[PDB]
Design a protein around this ligand. Structure first.
Ligand SMILES: FC(F)(F)c1cccnc1N1CCNCC1
Ligand SMILES: FC(F)(F)c1cccnc1N1CCNCC1
Ligand SMILES: [Mg+2]
Ligand SMILES: [Mg+2]
Lengths: 546, 546
């Protein structure tokens, strides 16, 4: 029956409410009880406040009117306002104090996820104060989570006027009885109730959610911790930079603030960062999530040498040049992890800070050929398998859904070991035709990857693995250096290829290296433990790159 | 004969030179003459400094070695270094003191423009200091101007070793006698001279340029003031945001820092900002130069209402939402100018600051229909001509080269008046078949526009002019407001359609409005007077939006 949920901003999706600062200020300042609320409402339907809420005037135009109102209210109450009494001040403070009420947001999210149409309906103002960015940020963070945002000052109507609920219903394409509406002000609920909408009077959040659970029949309270916000590909800004004649790089871009360049591993995608992209932007960074050369909408030239580290690095520098970026923070995973360590060693002036997930920094051994190093470690056997052009291409391209469904697995689910892969004749020889879906990924998400790999296949990706010697020679040039810019190594307990212990000597080359560590996390770090990844990167960004 | 020019960084393209701080510091501190230069060079070919310049070690690794060297040099000179003597300190200060030597850069630019191949060849270091961004910025600003940048620390070779000049010559694809090489250090010139390259020993800039003028036979000194840097379209980052199902917006993006959204007029392009894009990025802003709806690589739906101001504005807000931008500075010209005034009035929380070139802010007249307002002013007659769908489309699309060559004219060149256009039967009825090229535009540049307008033609563009009534109704809602966020109006003396005097009452609606004014500037502001435009916007950005 119920198909839509409507939430207010003040006192429902964001707390403390601002009218609340009228009551608090009166008490803090020992003013006549209600004096500030009287001034806020002076003239009712035709007073300053309603003109504000309808968008006839801006907030700065309103401030002196409210000032006058307070003056007149105190005259009639025969008291004096304190020296320093400032409506600008009170309102600035209250508006910066108000924060998203997280459980109410998660309830909206949940309802939207079971197919509800959701909306914010709010009496609000055109905000032109010097400090407006504060509110602009809040609304941005909230609105993306809802089907509609209806603002009194944009539609020229205010609760409790009945025409706004008609506008609401019309925007929802729903009949009143299909709608639950939550508000902290009872007068604002009445016209919803008159139309036969279910209403909830929000005093404390938890009780309001209990009512909402009862009435929708969906669990909202005591729900497990949800995943971080993901990205929908067709809502992203897609960027394209040509770095040389046959090579154009694609990236997704979100946020403002210091530039943070995300470099995915093999065989992956910008989309592998779908959980960090919104969290890092929300945390105050400008996120550039690449398709690395060889993948997705980036070019994929066929030649092996096009993917040695030196070429790849110089290309990443050109990409900053063309974007007019003097530096970026570089964060890599797996192959992208190796690449950012090289950016740090060969282009520190362009790297604000460097972090790697899973991929440790290991200096080249100038006395031992890389192939020999590789044959020492049974778990790198899969790398020998990747050497002969065509062999791994044919197995990986044969059935893309099956490829990513076999690769993208949480630590308790594997179908493929990286163990004696050559001898077996390949990666999937002992895995099923139709693997079960990992808990880390939906069917939709697998199909995104499938579709990306239909453009270029696995030649480009596999080429990253085919410059052992050439990378070894270039890396040898860096053996006298150390990495002395800010650096974070994040180890994954259950990555059985890039094991935590392989990172154990890193402090010799990076004396001030910082660390994080994630337990019960396999190789696909960002999607396996997206909450822990976000929290470790934001903490390290805030303290080391900001 | 001469076909290439090679410049050093320190003491040639950037001044003061850093070895210069060794001499200065000695003098400032009353140290034994040359003590610091001795320490800088200790061990020569195998000393710390050469390993630095070859990229064996980073700058921070070098700092303690140079410290030791100074200690040993003073021991042997039997003096003591002052308390507080800090190589880190001296080097930080010197490296931030060094700035582009503008006349040397303009000489390189000029030579490149007459077809020289140009290069920077420099002995330099991998810079990993906390303050490295300073140098990263310099190199970025310089390198874009040259065909090659060759850095000792990247190629593992240093001047004066002969192998670097061979590497140089090989990079240039030129024989030694086709090359002029400038350096401030004579020892570094010798191996160039040995190979038969022309050399210039740069002491003072002007004399070095006199020598360079003599030897290339091209005027470099006392040249008129050059245009600002322009953009090459295929070197830009191209961004694409879908703002609703049939509407995707394209923009070009350059720089980091506060977001600055550039909105072009009718019938124009992101490319109309080609002169401001690099200058604003260089000045510390993140430039987003739009193709506005209807143009270039943005979508161009056919329906008239798709281009009323309300839809256009809401779309620009969505574009910030999807980019994760809580605000941007909005700078408009002509129609984009009108649009940003509306952004200011209807979305001040999203507008950090607003500026318009040519387009004044005039409040709707609630008592007079817009059509009547329009018929009052003979100079708006061209707008009546634009109303009937198809008519102006057919004339404007008939011959694109002729269209833009007729439209884009400096104030002393016009072929078309905006005068009794309806009566005449159109815009070009009294203009030539093949107009002469304006001084403001090359043939290449016209052809860029031609090619952009081949995608969608003039229906979308013309539609901007076809919502007089609808814009009038929406604007009426804003008649109680004022614009109280930072605002700049730039008038153009010789725009005979958007005349300076039409902006004369603006302080009534925008009390703290700031102004600039450009003389002898026609309607095509950005390309007519690009130097004056850049200087007025950067000054206003720095003081009001930063
Ligand atoms: F097959 C596979 F993709 F290689 C792979 C499969 C499973 C686990 N880890 C893998 N690797 C990713 C590439 N770098 C080394 C680790
Ligand atoms: F033809 C033309 F494009 F309209 C035009 C031609 C010449 C000068 N100014 C023009 N206008 C540009 C559009 N807005 C009004 C001014
Ligand atoms: Mg409320
Ligand atoms: Mg020099």
């Amino acid at each position: 029956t119920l198909r839509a949920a409507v939430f207010d901003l003040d006192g429902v999706l964001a707390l403390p409410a601002v009218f609340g600062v009228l009551g608090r200020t009166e008490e803090a300042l020992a003013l006549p009880r209600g004096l500030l609320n009287d001034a806020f409402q002076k003239g009712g339907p035709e007073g300053a406040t309603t003109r504000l809420m309808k968008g006839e005037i801006t907030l700065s135009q309103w401030i002196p009117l409210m000032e006058e109102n307070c003056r007149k209210c105190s005259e009639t109450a025969k008291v004096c306002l304190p020296k320093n009494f400032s409506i600008k001040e009170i309102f600035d403070k209250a508006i910066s104090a108000r924060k998203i009420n997280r459980p109410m947001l998660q309830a909206a999210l949940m309802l939207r996820k079971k197919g509800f149409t959701t909306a914010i309906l709010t009496n609000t103002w055109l905000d032109d104060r010097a400090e407006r960015d504060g509110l602009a940020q809040l609304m941005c963070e909230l609105k993306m989570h809802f089907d509609f945002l209806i603002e009194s000052c944009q539609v020229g109507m205010v609760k409790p006027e009945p025409q706004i609920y008609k506008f609401l219903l019309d925007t929802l394409k729903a009949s009143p009885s299909e709608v639950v509406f939550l508000d902290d002000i009872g007068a604002n609920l009445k016209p919803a109730r008159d139309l036969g909408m279910v209403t909830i009077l929000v005093q404390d959040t938890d009780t309001a959610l209990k009512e909402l659970e009862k009435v929708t029949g969906i669990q909202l309270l005591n729900t497990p911790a949800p995943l971080p916000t993901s990205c929908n590909p067709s809502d992203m800004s897609h960027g394209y930079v040509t770095v040389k004649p046959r090579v154009r790089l694609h990236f997704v871009e979100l946020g403002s603030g210091p530039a943070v360049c995300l470099c995915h591993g093999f065989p992956e995608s910008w989309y592998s960062w779908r959980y960090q992209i919104p969290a890092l932007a929300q945390a105050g960074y400008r996120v550039l999530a690449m398709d690395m050369k060889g993948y997705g909408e980036s070019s994929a030239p066929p030649e092996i040498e096009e993917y040695c580290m030196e070429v790849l690095c110089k290309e990443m520098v050109t990409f900053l040049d063309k974007l007019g970026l003097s530096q970026a923070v570089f964060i890599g995973h797996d192959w992208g992890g190796m690449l950012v360590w090289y950016m740090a060693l060969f282009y520190p002036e362009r790297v604000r800070a460097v972090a790697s997930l899973n991929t440790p920094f290991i200096p080249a051994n100038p006395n031992m050929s890389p192939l020999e190093s590789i044959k020492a470690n049974p778990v790198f056997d899969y790398q020998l398998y990747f050497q002969e052009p065509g062999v791994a291409e044919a197995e990986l391209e044969q059935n893309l859904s099956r490829t990513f469904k076999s690769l993208f697995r949480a630590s308790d689910e594997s179908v493929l070991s990286m163990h004696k892969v050559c001898e077996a004749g390949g990666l999937f020889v002992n895995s099923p035709e139709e693997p079960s879906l990992s808990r880390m990924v939906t069917e939709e998400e697998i199909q995104f990857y499938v579709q990306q790999f239909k453009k270029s296949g696995f030649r480009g990706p596999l080429n990253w693995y085919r410059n052992m010697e050439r990378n070894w020679k270039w890396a040898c040039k860096s053996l006298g250096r150390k990495i002395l810019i800010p650096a974070l190594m994040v180890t994954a307990e259950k990555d059985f290829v890039l094991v935590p212990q392989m990172s154990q000597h890193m402090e010799d080359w990076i004396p001030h290296l910082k660390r994080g560590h994630i337990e019960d996390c396999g190789h696909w770090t960002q999607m396996d433990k997206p909450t822990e990844v976000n929290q470790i990167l934001i903490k390290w960004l805030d303290s080391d790159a900001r």
